[PDB]
A paper describes a structure:
All competent bacteria require [name] to transport the transforming DNA across the cytoplasmic membrane. Most [name] orthologues are comprised of three domains: an OB fold encoded near the N-terminus, a central competence domain consisting of a bundle of transmembrane helices forming a channel and a C-terminal β-lactamase-like domain. The β-lactamase-like domain of [name] is a member of the metallo-β-lactamase (MBL) superfamily.
We determined the 1.8 Å crystal structure of BLACTMg, consisting of the characteristic αβ/βα fold that defines the MBL superfamily. The active site is positioned at one end of a wide shallow groove between the sandwiched central β-sheets. The absence of coordinated Mn2+ ions prevents the active site from adopting a fully catalytically competent conformation. Taken together, BLACTMg coordinates two Mn2+ in its catalytic centre in order to function as a DNA nuclease. Mutation of most residues involved in metal coordination render BLACTMg virtually inactive in our nuclease activity assay, with the only exception being D600A that showed a ∼5 fold reduction in the apparent initial rate compared to WT. In summary, in vitro the BLACTMg functions as a 5′-to-3′ exonuclease and an endonuclease.
Residue numbers in the entry: 532 to 797
The structure:
Amino acid sequence: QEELKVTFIDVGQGDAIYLATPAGRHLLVDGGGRPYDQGDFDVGERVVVPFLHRQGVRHLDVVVSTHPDADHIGGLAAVVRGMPVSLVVVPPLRGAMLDAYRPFLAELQARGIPWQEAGRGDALALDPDLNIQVLHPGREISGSNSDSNNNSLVLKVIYRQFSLLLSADIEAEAMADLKANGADVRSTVFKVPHHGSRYGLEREFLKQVAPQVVVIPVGEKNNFGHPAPEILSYWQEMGVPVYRTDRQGAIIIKSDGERWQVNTTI
């Protein structure tokens, strides 16, 4: 019954979220995403794996690759090459999406690392005190299975009264679907999708999340103007503090399931 500790690693314009669970399990959600820095600097080798060593991690129980487009795998390649990984979770892979993932999945097979496709209604049993629910995407052969950002994996991490919604890169169309299907998205902490892009502004969905604080992993002087002013304005309208990795470095959230705290690096 150690506290849950979640670190949003400062990986620039990218997401990498390390969760140390109460029982002592190690979970990594993403590893920096698509290299907009042309990949010459591998954020996985240079930032993520060294971070995990500095936190004392020697193996990861679960690695989650949230995005169905394989050129978003990014630093996760370096993670599975740089330390033992017991399980990789990916979204439902279909069509050309599976195609592009095939080299990564072949490396997993060569390493003996099982992978699991996860979709709406699944859960990642890892720690008996943590409920890790997969809310999105569904598995239906539906319209635009190929709609990449909107079919990224959404996870809700629950420890008693504390919850964290890891929204990956979803946009307003996915948010409307989640709202329409009654997804239980109300959360203590909301990870804003796709670095605060304005295309994640779905007010009915965000009203239901009703977060106490939000976290934006986002890079300084990224090419997209992230986080969008419309997104920052929205959280101001709601009175919700915004934590950002570009301005504040790594963001650390700790909780015993009743009390929780957010701290920053810079």
